[PDB]
Design a protein around this nucleic acid. Structure first.
Length: 90
RNA sequence: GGGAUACCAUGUUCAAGUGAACGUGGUAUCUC
């Protein structure tokens, strides 16, 4: 595992729909010699699960995704969630 | 000259589960 394609597919393909909405926030103090990149993978309801903090920007992106991908049971739960939804708000 | 972050213009391709990332041209710091 530990790959982009696999992650983006899981999170975006497996999870994510018309409703809800999860994002990725990148925060770090990137230095010429010493680089760092954290990524907060949260969801509309304010739930953070995918936190990938690597050395560069990429590993951060792919690291965060992978972090969430570690919660397969969660991704599925969400999947059934996005489907179970009664297609409404109030 | 090898490499990395950052930025701007733009494109390829990977998977084939289905959706996305990097590359590349050049500027710049730094680094080896």
């Amino acid at each position: 595992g530990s790959l982009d394609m696999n992650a983006k597919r899981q999170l975006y393909s497996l999870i994510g729909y018309a409703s809800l909405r999860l994002h990725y926030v990148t925060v770090k103090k990137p230095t010429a010699v010493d680089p760092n990149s954290i990524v907060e993978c949260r969801v509309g309801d304010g739930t953070v699960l995918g936190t990938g903090v690597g050395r560069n920007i990429k590993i951060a992106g792919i690291r965060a995704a992978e972090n969430a991908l570690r919660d397969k049971k969660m991704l599925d739960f969400y999947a059934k969630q996005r489907a179970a939804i009664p297609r409404s708000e109030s």
